[PDB]
Nucleic acid binder design. Sequence first.
DNA 1: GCCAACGTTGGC
DNA 2: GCCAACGTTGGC
Length: 44
Amino acid sequence: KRKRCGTCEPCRRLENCGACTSCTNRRTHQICKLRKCEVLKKKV
DNA sequence: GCCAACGTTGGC
DNA sequence: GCCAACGTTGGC
Ligand SMILES: [Zn+2]
Ligand SMILES: [Zn+2]
């Protein structure tokens, strides 16, 4: 697993949105879509 | 042991 | 080609 960059706009966000697939569907095991690190959205 | 969330992949 | 679902790690 890679680590989030910590400094992109999504990484800086503190709150989960509550409304995306991640936030409403905890079965996904994903971070809030608005918080997903821009670096991690690119495949290795 | 809990909890958050990354990597993979099957289903579309 | 995308992404929801699952298995898994890794910080604590
Ligand atoms: Zn969200
Ligand atoms: Zn980031």
